[PDB]
Design an enzyme around this catalytic site. Structure first.
Site, PDB file in Angstrom:
ATOM      1  N   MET A 133       0.636  -1.205   0.161  1.00 54.01           N
ATOM      2  CA  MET A 133      -0.028  -0.355   0.390  1.00 54.01           C
ATOM      3  C   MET A 133       0.664   1.211  -0.203  1.00 54.01           C
ATOM      4  O   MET A 133       0.357   2.199  -0.961  1.00 54.01           O
ATOM      5  CB  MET A 133      -1.326   0.095   1.240  1.00 54.01           C
ATOM      6  CG  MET A 133      -2.099  -1.098   1.124  1.00 54.01           C
ATOM      7  SD  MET A 133      -3.520  -0.830   2.119  1.00 54.01           S
ATOM      8  CE  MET A 133      -2.743  -1.425   3.607  1.00 54.01           C
ATOM      9  N   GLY A 134       1.810   1.428   0.675  1.00 58.88           N
ATOM     10  CA  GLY A 134       2.870   2.085   0.832  1.00 58.88           C
ATOM     11  C   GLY A 134       3.836   1.871   1.709  1.00 58.88           C
ATOM     12  O   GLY A 134       3.844   0.870   2.554  1.00 58.88           O
ATOM     13  N   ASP A 150      -0.752   6.667  13.931  1.00 56.33           N
ATOM     14  CA  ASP A 150       0.670   7.200  13.988  1.00 56.33           C
ATOM     15  C   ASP A 150       1.076   7.527  15.317  1.00 56.33           C
ATOM     16  O   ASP A 150       0.859   8.388  15.336  1.00 56.33           O
ATOM     17  CB  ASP A 150       1.163   7.511  13.137  1.00 56.33           C
ATOM     18  CG  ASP A 150       2.908   6.803  11.882  1.00 56.33           C
ATOM     19  OD1 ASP A 150       3.501   5.969  13.235  1.00 56.33           O
ATOM     20  OD2 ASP A 150       2.661   6.556  11.279  1.00 56.33           O
ATOM     21  N   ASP A 161       3.083  14.741  15.876  1.00 56.69           N
ATOM     22  CA  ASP A 161       2.923  14.418  14.131  1.00 56.69           C
ATOM     23  C   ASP A 161       2.174  14.628  13.706  1.00 56.69           C
ATOM     24  O   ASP A 161       1.450  13.775  12.527  1.00 56.69           O
ATOM     25  CB  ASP A 161       3.642  13.043  13.539  1.00 56.69           C
ATOM     26  CG  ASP A 161       5.114  13.105  12.518  1.00 56.69           C
ATOM     27  OD1 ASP A 161       5.373  14.746  11.785  1.00 56.69           O
ATOM     28  OD2 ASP A 161       5.455  11.834  11.983  1.00 56.69           O
TER      29      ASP A 161
HETATM   30  C1  LIG Z   1       1.448   6.823   1.162  1.00 56.55           C
HETATM   31  N1  LIG Z   1      -0.087   6.197   0.870  1.00 56.55           N
HETATM   32  C2  LIG Z   1      -0.331   5.329  -0.260  1.00 56.55           C
HETATM   33  C3  LIG Z   1      -0.776   5.346   1.945  1.00 56.55           C
HETATM   34  C4  LIG Z   1       0.489   4.788   2.491  1.00 56.55           C
HETATM   35  C5  LIG Z   1      -0.668   3.385   3.989  1.00 56.55           C
HETATM   36  C6  LIG Z   1      -0.839   4.270   4.880  1.00 56.55           C
HETATM   37  N2  LIG Z   1      -1.876   3.547   5.707  1.00 56.55           N
HETATM   38  C7  LIG Z   1      -3.654   2.849   5.682  1.00 56.55           C
HETATM   39  N3  LIG Z   1      -4.006   2.673   4.669  1.00 56.55           N
HETATM   40  C8  LIG Z   1      -5.177   1.945   4.865  1.00 56.55           C
HETATM   41  N4  LIG Z   1      -5.464   1.687   5.942  1.00 56.55           N
HETATM   42  C9  LIG Z   1      -4.867   1.669   7.044  1.00 56.55           C
HETATM   43  N5  LIG Z   1      -5.002   1.448   8.168  1.00 56.55           N
HETATM   44  C10 LIG Z   1      -4.046   2.149   8.852  1.00 56.55           C
HETATM   45  C11 LIG Z   1      -2.697   2.583   8.327  1.00 56.55           C
HETATM   46  C12 LIG Z   1      -1.901   2.856   9.327  1.00 56.55           C
HETATM   47  C13 LIG Z   1      -1.782   3.186  10.514  1.00 56.55           C
HETATM   48  C14 LIG Z   1      -0.520   4.121  10.690  1.00 56.55           C
HETATM   49  O1  LIG Z   1       0.941   2.705  10.872  1.00 56.55           O
HETATM   50  C15 LIG Z   1       0.577   2.887   8.730  1.00 56.55           C
HETATM   51  C16 LIG Z   1      -0.487   2.199   8.197  1.00 56.55           C
HETATM   52  C17 LIG Z   1      -3.565   2.397   6.879  1.00 56.55           C
HETATM   53  C18 LIG Z   1      -2.353   4.944   3.823  1.00 56.55           C
HETATM   54  C19 LIG Z   1      -1.743   6.107   3.229  1.00 56.55           C
END
Ligand SMILES: CN(C)[C@H]1CC[C@H](Nc2ncnc3[nH]cc(C4CCOCC4)c23)CC1
Length: 279
Positions: free
Chosen positions: A29-30, A157, A139
């Site tokens: 996802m990233g 986070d 943050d």
């Molecule tokens: C850069 N961009 C594409 C993304 C990078 C991944 C990000 N994370 C999430 N996406 C979907 N469900 C999620 N639940 C929890 C998380 C987080 C919680 C804190 O620690 C990291 C994961 C999370 C979303 C944006």
């Protein structure tokens, strides 16, 4: 309190930690500075699995998550610590981060002014809960504001969260308060960072852009005050429903949050009050 997963369970549900992006049929996802985020499927439920790549941030995240549960805070479901690898399992946020949605990443349509107002209110409700429970986020930024299936804002986070001075200055420079850059730990620094987020919501511009003049978004506050420009010149052109009154009302909150003197900034309860009056 949270489910204890074995490393092998998270290994299979993430298709052996498939590092390929979601768009190419993978599970990635990233990634952040502390780990890679993978999409997982546990008993017909979609999850976000953060494989950490550090132990103090793992422990702090679990500690804060056990104490703070709210509608505008991302929920932790479980963890893995049995291997040499540390994993954190969260509730999946289908609409990713506020940063990604403001930038229309992967073809997503621009957020309307109506959705943006609800997100700002939700994020403020989340910060309010953290401050009522005597926690400083440290943050606050659009990348740390997640969006669920109904675009409900969820602060994420809590690895750097604190329950005052420090020798280890941490956070994102473009969002940080002057005193936070100096080493101070105060809930008033979270207010300043929220002010930057409000400016990103109004403008659709990232907090920092090296190929931009000015590079830092908080500097537009100076251009508006010095009458060089107006908030109307900076309103995101990717919206069709923004009205001057509510945009000026959100800008007024952002301006108050961005006071250089920490004691002149409003508390989160006042921020929450002003955002409700806006709608
Ligand atoms: C850069 N961009 C594409 C993304 C990078 C991944 C990000 N994370 C999430 N996406 C979907 N469900 C999620 N639940 C929890 C998380 C987080 C919680 C804190 O620690 C990291 C994961 C999370 C979303 C944006």
């Amino acid at each position: 309190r949270f489910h204890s997963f074995s490393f092998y369970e998270l290994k299979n549900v993430t298709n052996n930690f498939d590092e390929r992006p979601i768009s190419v049929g993978g599970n990635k996802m990233g990634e952040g500075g502390f780990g890679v985020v993978y999409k997982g499927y546990v008993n017909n439920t979609t999850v976000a699995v953060k494989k950490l790549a550090l132990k103090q941030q793992f422990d702090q995240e679990i500690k804060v998550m056990a104490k703070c549960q709210h509608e505008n805070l991302v929920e932790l479901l479980g963890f893995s610590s049995d291997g040499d690898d540390l994993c954190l399992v969260y509730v999946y946020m289908p609409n990713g981060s506020l940063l990604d949605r403001l930038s229309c990443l992967d073809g997503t349509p621009p957020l309307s002014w109506h959705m943006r107002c609800k997100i700002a209110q939700g994020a403020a409700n989340g910060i309010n809960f953290l401050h009522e429970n005597h926690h400083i986020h440290r943050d606050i930024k659009s990348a740390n504001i997640l969006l669920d299936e109904a675009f409900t804002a969820k602060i994420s986070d809590f690895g750097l969260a604190r329950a005052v001075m420090t020798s280890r200055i941490v956070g994102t420079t473009a969002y940080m308060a002057p005193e936070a850059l100096r080493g101070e730990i105060t809930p008033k620094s979270d207010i300043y960072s929220f002010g930057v987020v409000l400016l990103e919501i109004i403008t659709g511009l990232p907090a920092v852009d090296e190929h931009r003049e000015p590079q830092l978004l908080l500097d537009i506050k100076e251009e508006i005050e010095d009458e060089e420009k107006t908030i109307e010149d900076y309103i995101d052109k990717k919206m069709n429903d923004a009205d001057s009154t509510s945009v000026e009302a959100m800008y007024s909150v952002a301006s108050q949050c961005l006071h250089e003197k920490k004691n002149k900034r409003p508390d989160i309860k006042k921020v929450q009050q002003l955002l409700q009056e806006m709608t």
